[PDB]
Amino acid sequence: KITLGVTYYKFDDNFLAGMRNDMIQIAKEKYPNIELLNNDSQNSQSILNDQIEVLINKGVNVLVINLVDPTAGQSVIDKAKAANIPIILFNKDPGVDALNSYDKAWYVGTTPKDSGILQGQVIEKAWLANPAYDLNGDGVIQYVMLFGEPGQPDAEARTKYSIEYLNEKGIKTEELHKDIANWDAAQAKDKMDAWLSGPNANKIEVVIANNDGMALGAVESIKAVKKELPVFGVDAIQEALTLIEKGEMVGTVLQDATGQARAILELANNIANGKEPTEGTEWKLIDKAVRVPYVGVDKDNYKEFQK
Numbered sequence: 001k002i003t004l005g006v007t008y009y010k011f012d013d014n015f016l017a018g019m020r021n022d023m024i025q026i027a028k029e030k031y032p033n034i035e036l037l038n039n040d041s042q043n044s045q046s047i048l049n050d051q052i053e054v055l056i057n058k059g060v061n062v063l064v065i066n067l068v069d070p071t072a073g074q075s076v077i078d079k080a081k082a083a084n085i086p087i088i089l090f091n092k093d094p095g096v097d098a099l100n101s102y103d104k105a106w107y108v109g110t111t112p113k114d115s116g117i118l119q120g121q122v123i124e125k126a127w128l129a130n131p132a133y134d135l136n137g138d139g140v141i142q143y144v145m146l147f148g149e150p151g152q153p154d155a156e157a158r159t160k161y162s163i164e165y166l167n168e169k170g171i172k173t174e175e176l177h178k179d180i181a182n183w184d185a186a187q188a189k190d191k192m193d194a195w196l197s198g199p200n201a202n203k204i205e206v207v208i209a210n211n212d213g214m215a216l217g218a219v220e221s222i223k224a225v226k227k228e229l230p231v232f233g234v235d236a237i238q239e240a241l242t243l244i245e246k247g248e249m250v251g252t253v254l255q256d257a258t259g260q261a262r263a264i265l266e267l268a269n270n271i272a273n274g275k276e277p278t279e280g281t282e283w284k285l286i287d288k289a290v291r292v293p294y295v296g297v298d299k300d301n302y303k304e305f306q307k
């Protein structure tokens with residue numbers, strides 16, 4: 001058999017929970033010779049470090065690692081190298097220097113700039129179609145920004161490029177608030193409650209979140225005070241598609257969890273068997289990474305992605 005030691009920074013992360021289910025299913029359906037050892041790092045890099053050691057000692061064929069601390073890539077790769085076991089990092093990108101430090105390191109993820117641009121496009125379309133969104137009539141989008149995880153490039157890229165896209169198309173924006181909620185619905189709900197209970201809550205026209213999980217929390221907060229505000233996320237998790245169906249979210253951006261899970265399995269299968277990681281697959285490694293594209297989602301196409 002081939003054994004993959006797979007770690008997830010925490011099990012309640014919505015997007016990664018979907019990917020974990022996908023990987024389990026694909027492995028069962030297509031790879032009878034692969035065994036998955038799944039690990040929950042409890043949002044602790046120290047727990048992850050110990051888990052990596054356990055998996056090394058158990059002699060897994062490939063380490064498949066999701067960083068807890070998004071800056072800890074070099075240390076994790078160093079452990080794999082010292083153990084002489086190949087490593088595929090996923091979802092939290094350790095950067096090129098770290099990947100280049102080990103001949104048996106690879107990465108599967110995305111180019112989050114592209115998701116920021118798509119989110120901007122989704123917002124632009126909805127904004128233009130709904131003049132009522134512009135509550136103060138100034139032509140400017142007064143927004144709040146729910147930022148994900150500091151140091152995880154998906155967060156800064158979605159924050160930067162969504163707004164830059166809008167401005168590039170001649171749509172003025174004004175940031176009323178921006179705060180960190182770490183991909184988490186409950187944290188986002190708390191932040192949104194603070195914003196909606198503030199003296200100037202009325203100024204908010206658009207809610208932008210770096211992921212769907214935080215958008216879910218924002219929606220709970222908005223519903224409680226009986227307001228109607230357009231909310232945008234990223235991932236197209238099923239819960240968000242349902243909110244779009246219900247008219248409680250306006251848009252998101254599909255992040256392809258199934259494709260990422262498939263890439264991890266296909267690359268790991270090759271790596272474990274002395275084959276070039278992309279052999280017999282659709283994937284291209286650019287600077288040792290697979291970058292799986294995103295898709296913009298709104299009321300007009302969300303049905304295509306429901307399961």
Ligand SMILES: OC[C@H]1O[C@@H](O)[C@H](O)[C@@H](O)[C@H]1O
Pocket residue numbers: 013014015016091092152154183210211212213234235255
């Ligand atoms: O690093 C974990 C995060 O990764 C992002 O790509 C995703 O949009 C978030 O929902 C969360 O899963």
Ligand SMILES: [Ca+2]
Pocket residue numbers: 134135136137138139140141142205
């Ligand atoms: Ca306005």
Ligand code: NA
Pocket residue numbers: 007008009010039040041048065066067068
């Ligand atoms: Na992990």
